[PDB]
C-alpha cells in the first residue's frame, strides 16, 4: 500500500521545464508570460511527464498535517517535492472522499474553486452546479501519434490508463466520433483523472512510435456534457429518485 512508504520525487527540481513557453512570436510579454507579435495553429503539446500510481504514491507532509487536497503536480507526474510536499500524493479513495465532503461542493479535489458555468470548451475545473462524474476523452488521434488502431483496442487502452485512477462506473468508446466517455464512482476521482490524463499519450512501450511520443499533441480530457441517450437518461432519473429517497430519511431524522 502507498501508506506503507514515503512519496517519491517524480521530477528533480533541476529537471523541471522552464516557465518560459515555446516561442510563438517575436516578443515575450513579461506581464502575461506569453509570446506576442505572431500566430500559431495549435499550441498544445504532449506532456513529458506521467503519473505512475503504484510507483510514485506515498506519504507526504500533507498526511501528517491533515491535508485534505491532493497534489496537482503529483497527478501530472511532475511534483518535485516528493515526501516534503504539502499536498497528498496518492489516488483519491473513499476515506479521503469522506474527509473532502464539506469542501467538495465548491472545490475540486485539488482545492481549486469551481465556477458557476462550464467553460465554453467544457475544460477547466468544472461547475459547482453539477456533480459531474463523467469525462470526455478527445484527441485520441494525436495521443496515438495518428497510429491506425481498431476501436476495441482504443477502448482497451483507455480502460487501462483510466481504471488505475480510481473506481470506474462505466466506459464507452464512440467510434462514430472517435471519442471516449469515462464515468467514475466519485467526482474527486474524475477531477484527479482529468488532470492526470490531460495532454498524455496513449502509446505503450510495445509500439513503434514510442520514441516519437512527444511529437504531436496529447489526449484532450474535458468534462462531459449531458448524455442524450434515452437509455442513459432514464437511469440518470432513477439515480435522482434513489438519491432523493436516501435524503428524505435524513430529513425526517433531523426533523
Amino acid at each position: 500500500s502507498w501508506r506503507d512508504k514515503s512519496a517519491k520525487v517524480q521530477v528533480k527540481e533541476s529537471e523541471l521545464p522552464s516557465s518560459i513557453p515555446a516561442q510563438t512570436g517575436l516578443t515575450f510579454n513579461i506581464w502575461y508570460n506569453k509570446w506576442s507579435q505572431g500566430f500559431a495553429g495549435n499550441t498544445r503539446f504532449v506532456s513529458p511527464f506521467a503519473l505512475q500510481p503504484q510507483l510514485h504514491s506515498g506519504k507526504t507532509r500533507g498526511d501528517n498535517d491533515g491535508q485534505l487536497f491532493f497534489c496537482l503536480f503529483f497527478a501530472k507526474g511532475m511534483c518535485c517535492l516528493g515526501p516534503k510536499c504539502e499536498y497528498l500524493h496518492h489516488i483519491p479513495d473513499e476515506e479521503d472522499i469522506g474527509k473532502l465532503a464539506l469542501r467538495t461542493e465548491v472545490l475540486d479535489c485539488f482545492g481549486r474553486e469551481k465556477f458557476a458555468d462550464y467553460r465554453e470548451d467544457m475544460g477547466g475545473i468544472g461547475s459547482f452546479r453539477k456533480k459531474n462524474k463523467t469525462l470526455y476523452v478527445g484527441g485520441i488521434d494525436g495521443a496515438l501519434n495518428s497510429k491506425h488502431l481498431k476501436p476495441a483496442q482504443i477502448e482497451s487502452r483507455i480502460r487501462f490508463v483510466f481504471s488505475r485512477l480510481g473506481d470506474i462506473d462505466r466506459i464507452r468508446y464512440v467510434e462514430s466520433k472517435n471519442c471516449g466517455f469515462v464515468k467514475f464512482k466519485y467526482q474527486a476521482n474524475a477531477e484527479f483523472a482529468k488532470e492526470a490524463m490531460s495532454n498524455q499519450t496513449l502509446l505503450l512501450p510495445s509500439d513503434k512510435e514510442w520514441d516519437d511520443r512527444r511529437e504531436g499533441t496529447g489526449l484532450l480530457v474535458k468534462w462531459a456534457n449531458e448524455d442524450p441517450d434515452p437509455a442513459a437518461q432514464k437511469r440518470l432519473q432513477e439515480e435522482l429518485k434513489l438519491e432523493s429517497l436516501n435524503m428524505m430519511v435524513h430529513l425526517i431524522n433531523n426533523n
Partner: protein, 264 residues
C-alpha cells in the same frame, strides 16, 4: 450590509473563530459583483482557509451558505432540495440561473427567493414539507464471436481458469459494484464490462485466486438481486470479444438476451 450567512458545519465545533473581513475583497461567483469577503479557519492550526465565495444577496436569494452553497436549513445542494420540494408540491420548483454577465448582475439585485428558497427560508413551510416527504418515503458478426464466447461450457470445480465470462449484466449496474462483490467473496481483478453488450469478462491475478472465486457461488453472481451469470472463460479475452462497433454490441446483447430467456 447584512452579516454573512455561514453555516455551523463550515464554522466547526471550535469554541471561538477569528474571521477576517475584506470590503470589496472579491467578485461573487454567482453574480460577478463585488462583495465583502470573509475568510476564516476552523482552528488556528488547521491547514485550510474557508472563504465566502458568494455575496450575501445571492446567498439570501438561494437560502444557502456563502462558504459551501448548501441550503442553510437542510444543508443539502440546491438541485436536490428543489427536486425534493418538487416531489411533494408537484409544482416542480427550480432555481434558474442567468448566463449573461449583465443578466447575472441584474438578477442578483432582485429582492426575491429563487426555487426552493421560498420553502426552506420560512421554517414553518420547511417543517410543513418534511412531514409530507415522510409519506413519500414510506411509500452482424455475432455468429462468429459466439464461438469465441465460452457459452458452450459450464461452471466447474476441476478446470483451473484465471478468466471468466459475465452475462445478464443489467445496465444499471456500475463496474465498481461487480469488482466490489467479487472482492467481498474473495476477502480482499481486471474487469471489462460493455454495457451495450450487457456482458463482460473478468481476469484474475493468478490461478489460485480464480480457483477461490469459483469455489464460491454455469454459475451465478448477485448484485442487488440482479443475477449476473458466470462461465469459466479459458480462452483469453479482450475488449474485442464483445464486438468492434456499437451495433455489434447491441446485436450481441439481444442474442444473449434470447439465450438467457431460453436458459431460464
Amino acid at each position: 450590509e447584512p452579516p454573512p450567512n455561514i453555516c455551523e458545519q463550515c464554522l466547526g465545533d471550535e469554541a471561538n473563530i477569528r474571521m477576517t473581513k475584506i470590503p470589496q475583497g472579491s467578485e461573487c461567483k454567482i453574480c460577478t459583483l463585488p462583495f465583502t469577503l470573509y475568510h476564516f479557519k476552523t482552528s488556528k492550526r488547521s491547514n485550510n482557509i474557508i472563504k465566502t465565495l458568494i455575496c450575501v444577496r445571492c446567498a439570501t436569494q438561494r437560502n444557502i451558505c456563502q462558504c459551501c452553497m448548501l441550503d442553510s436549513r437542510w444543508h443539502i445542494p440546491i438541485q436536490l432540495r428543489d427536486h425534493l420540494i418538487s416531489l411533494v408540491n408537484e409544482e416542480n420548483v427550480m432555481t434558474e440561473e442567468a448566463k449573461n454577465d449583465m443578466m447575472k448582475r441584474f438578477l442578483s439585485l432582485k429582492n426575491v427567493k429563487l426555487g426552493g428558497a421560498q420553502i426552506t427560508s420560512d421554517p414553518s413551510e420547511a417543517d410543513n414539507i418534511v412531514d409530507k416527504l415522510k409519506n413519500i418515503l414510506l411509500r452482424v458478426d455475432i455468429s462468429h464471436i459466439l464461438k469465441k464466447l465460452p457459452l458452450n461450457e459450464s461452471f466447474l470445480k476441476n478446470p483451473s481458469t484465471k478468466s471468466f465470462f459475465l452475462y445478464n449484466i443489467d445496465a444499471s449496474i456500475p463496474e465498481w459494484k461487480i469488482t466490489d462483490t467479487v472482492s467481498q467473496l474473495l476477502g480482499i481483478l481486471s474487469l471489462i464490462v460493455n454495457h451495450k453488450a450487457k456482458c463482460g469478462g473478468l481476469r484474475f491475478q493468478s490461478s489460485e485466486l480464480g480457483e477461490r472465486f469459483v469455489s464460491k457461488i454455469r454459475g451465478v453472481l448477485l448484485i442487488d438481486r440482479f443475477r449476473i451469470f458466470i462461465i469459466p472463460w479459458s480462452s483469453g479475452f479482450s475488449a474485442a470479444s464483445f464486438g468492434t462497433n456499437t451495433a455489434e454490441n447491441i446485436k450481441l446483447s439481444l442474442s444473449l438476451n434470447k439465450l438467457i430467456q431460453l436458459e431460464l
